């Protein structure tokens, strides 16, 4: 009587931010175009992104605006952030882990 998928990935948390002076103030990298997942290229020091926190530079985006980030190209994810509007919600997880793995 057990239940649970296989593969204990990092913390699957969602991100919530709005548009700024020159946009959300965040970029992405990778994609089907390069045969790799979508990560956060960099962050805007003076943008609403770097102020959000939920998302940082060096993470892996598994979801974007609630749209499964699969079989998608860096171009798509780029249009999704502008397709939603001023508010963009993507699922990101920090590679910090659950803590010290020892015992």
UniProtKB/Swiss-Prot annotation:
Tissues in which the UniProt entry reports expression: Specifically expressed in brain.
UniProt subcellular location: Cytoplasm; Late endosome; Synapse, Synaptosome; Cell membrane
Protein name, as recorded: Membrane-associated guanylate kinase, WW and PDZ domain-containing protein 2
Similarity comment: family membership: Belongs to the MAGUK family.
Domain PDZ residues, every copy: 14-96
Clinical note on disease: Nephrotic syndrome 15: A form of nephrotic syndrome, a renal disease clinically characterized by severe proteinuria, resulting in complications such as hypoalbuminemia, hyperlipidemia and edema. Kidney biopsies show non-specific histologic changes such as focal segmental glomerulosclerosis and diffuse mesangial proliferation. NPHS15 is an autosomal recessive form with onset in the first months of life. Disease severity is variable. Some patients show rapid progression to end-stage renal failure.
Subunit structure: Interacts (via its WW domains) with DRPLA. Interacts (via its second PDZ domain) with PTEN (via unphosphorylated C-terminus); this interaction diminishes the degradation rate of PTEN. Interacts (via guanylate kinase domain) with DLGAP1. Interacts (via the PDZ domains) with GRIN2A, GRID2 and NLGN1. Interacts with CTNND2, CTNNB1, MAGUIN-1, ACVR2A, SMAD2 and SMAD3. Part of a complex consisting of MAGI2/ARIP1, ACVR2A, ACVR1B and SMAD3. May interact with HTR2A. Interacts with IGSF9, RAPGEF2 and HTR4. Identified in a complex with ACTN4, CASK, IQGAP1, NPHS1, SPTAN1 and SPTBN1.
Organism placement in taxonomy: Eukaryota, Metazoa, Chordata, Craniata, Vertebrata
Span of the entire protein shown here: 1141 to 1230 of 1455
């Amino acid at each position: 009587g057990s239940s649970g998928s296989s593969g204990q990935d990092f913390d699957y948390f969602t991100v919530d931010m709005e548009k700024g002076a020159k946009g959300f103030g965040f970029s992405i990298r990778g994609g089907r175009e390069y045969k790799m997942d979508l990560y956060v290229l960099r962050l805007a020091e003076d943008g609403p992104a770097i102020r959000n926190g939920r998302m940082r530079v060096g993470d892996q985006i598994i979801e974007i605006n609630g749209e499964s980030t699969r079989d998608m190209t860096h171009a798509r994810a780029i249009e999704l952030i502008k397709s939603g509007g001023r508010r963009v919600r993507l699922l990101l997880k920090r590679g910090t882990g659950s803590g010290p793995s020892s015992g």
